[PDB]
A paper describes a structure:
All of these mutations are known as [name]-activating mutations that induce ligand-independent [name] activation, and recent studies have revealed in detail their structures and sensitivity to various [name] inhibitors. However, it has been reported that within a few years, most patients acquire resistance to these drugs, especially 50–70% of the patients acquired [name] resistance mutation in the ATP-binding pocket, known as a gatekeeper mutation. Despite this, ~10–20% of patients develop resistance to osimertinib because of the additional [name] mutation, which occurs at a cysteine residue required for covalent binding of osimertinib, and the resultant [name] compound mutant (activating mutation/[name]/[name]) showed marked resistance to all [name] inhibitors.
In this study, we first determined the binding mode of brigatinib with mutant [name] using crystal structure analysis. Brigatinib bound only to the receiver subunit of the [name] kinase domain, and the brigatinib-bound form of [name]-[name]/[name] was quite similar to the structural model we previously predicted by molecular dynamics (MD) simulations. In contrast, the M790 and S797 residues, which are the main causes of resistance to the existing [name]-TKIs, were slightly distant from brigatinib. These results indicated that brigatinib preferentially binds to the active conformation of the receiver subunit of the asymmetric [name] kinase dimer. Crystal structure analysis of brigatinib complexed with [name]-[name]/[name] mutant kinase showed that the hydrogen bonds between M793 of [name] and brigatinib play an important role in their binding, and L718, L792, and G796 were in close proximity to [name]-bound brigatinib.
Residue numbers in the entry:
A (entry chain B): 697 to 862, 866 to 871, 876 to 986, 991 to 1002, 1010 to 1018
B (entry chain A): 697 to 987, 1012 to 1019
Write the structure that this text describes.
Amino acid sequence: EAPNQALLRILKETEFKKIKVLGSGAFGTVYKGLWIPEGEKVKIPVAIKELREATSPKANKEILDEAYVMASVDNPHVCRLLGICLTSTVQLIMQLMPFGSLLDYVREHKDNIGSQYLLNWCVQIAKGMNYLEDRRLVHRDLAARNVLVKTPQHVKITDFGLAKLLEKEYHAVPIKWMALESILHRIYTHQSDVWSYGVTVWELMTFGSKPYDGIPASEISSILEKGERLPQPPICTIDVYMIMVKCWMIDADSRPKFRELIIEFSKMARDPQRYLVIQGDERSPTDSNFYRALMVVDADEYLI
Amino acid sequence: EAPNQALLRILKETEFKKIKVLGSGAFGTVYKGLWIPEGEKVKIPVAIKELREATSPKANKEILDEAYVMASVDNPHVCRLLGICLTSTVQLIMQLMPFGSLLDYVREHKDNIGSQYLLNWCVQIAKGMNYLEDRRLVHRDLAARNVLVKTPQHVKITDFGLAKLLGAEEKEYHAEGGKVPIKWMALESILHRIYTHQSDVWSYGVTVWELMTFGSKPYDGIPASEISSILEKGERLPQPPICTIDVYMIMVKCWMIDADSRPKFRELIIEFSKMARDPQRYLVIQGDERMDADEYLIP
Ligand SMILES: COc1cc(N2CCC(N3CCN(C)CC3)CC2)ccc1Nc1ncc(Cl)c(Nc2ccccc2P(C)(C)=O)n1
């Protein structure tokens, strides 16, 4: 092949600080963290994955393979891996963006978010996944909360808990955001990621409304077998919304492939106003509220 | 062009039940039913279509594309669908045309169909098909069996399982293979699998002769294979007895070999709307002097 001239930074546990916990699991747990590196004035937002136990050689094998893949990931729309840290409990530092996640952004800015932006993010999210899918990497948790805002023009999808097919499947919870075949079998393919990519665009178009809200997670299995999907967002034409219906096809192969979505979504992004209808579309970028919590330096800016 | 703000509603199959099979088909089965929107306290009678097997991705893509057209058309003479059900095998929920195909309607009632309705029914098909010509669409299976009767006064068009859309660039569409009823199709479609609206004027043509004879079998004894031969040779369908030569000439100008020689639907609307201003004059039928909610829920 080619040399994987990928770089692996070793940070010291006294450089990063765990602020609060994000997710948790049997083995492993994910925190919100601030990185203060090598005596600079800058503080960079990050998320840190910690093996819950420090002596488990099968678990320690796993957490390094993931470090391996996250460090091999070099794409503008998948988060970089800032560095690992060899405590007893091995830690991974993925970067975060200073402005926060899309969902919190889209919710806070829906009276000045435009049509060219919404369609421009669908290509960035789809570009990022087809990068991942290009690598036999399944993502298993795509959602607006896991798409971070670098600049209202650039978004990356966080890549913790990726699943390489080292083949037609790999097993492994976010019920609203999952394919039926995931709820009933806890199996994740790339086409189940397409389902997630579906629900992700829905959260975007609705300006951050909650998928299947109030409804219990035990029903979603059933109210999917029976054919209820998310409704049409108001601003969606029937061209946009057919993409979303196709992502939630019960048949997995009937679902759009990721290479297709970007073709389809940039074509619709060259005439943006023809596919999305937003009141006042014609007549602004700024800071967020996740960003207000921190007061604040992008990690892509420091390491340059 | 214009943003297509046509929405499609998604319905879970708990919101409708099927009461009666209206017909088995190669498409599959279509049922008669009541659809009670959850939330709403109306029942709306509906017709529910359900293909044989959702095994192929091609089968799914051709049912969701059939649903894309039906959902975005707002024409009075184009049967519209209410919503879709994304079950394992998807499901289509359309307004129930209570009276059947026109093909069924005019055999049962050959004894009580005056000239006014038959020419009114031809102005209505032509208006729906000129809506479809305006949306760059080719229906590709028009026939009295695919024209449904919501009321004797008002007829609508249906079954876009074979409908195909044109780009702005190409003026004609060409499929391969397929299974299409040979007796309703223009000669170029039989012979080159070419299609275009001018091939659908020919279909419209056969649809009238269907109506004008009160629902006969076109080329009845003739099997499908010979029709290419017989058309090339200049055989066409005979004159309906009810028909004047003014009216039967129009069906002739449809089965014209040259597709642009054939008449545009825009013309067909005017030519038949005049004819319905003096209907006794262009059609001759002995006796002719003598003879829950709905799509009211849409607005
Ligand atoms: C209840 O109203 C109907 C009655 C019948 N009848 C007509 C007489 C027929 N006869 C009666 C006498 N009997 C002894 C032998 C049979 C039985 C079926 C058929 C159809 C509708 N309405 C209806 N609405 C919407 C649709 Cl969308 C649809 N579609 C549809 C219905 C049936 C078959 C195919 C279709 P398609 C072309 C694929 O939509 N169909």
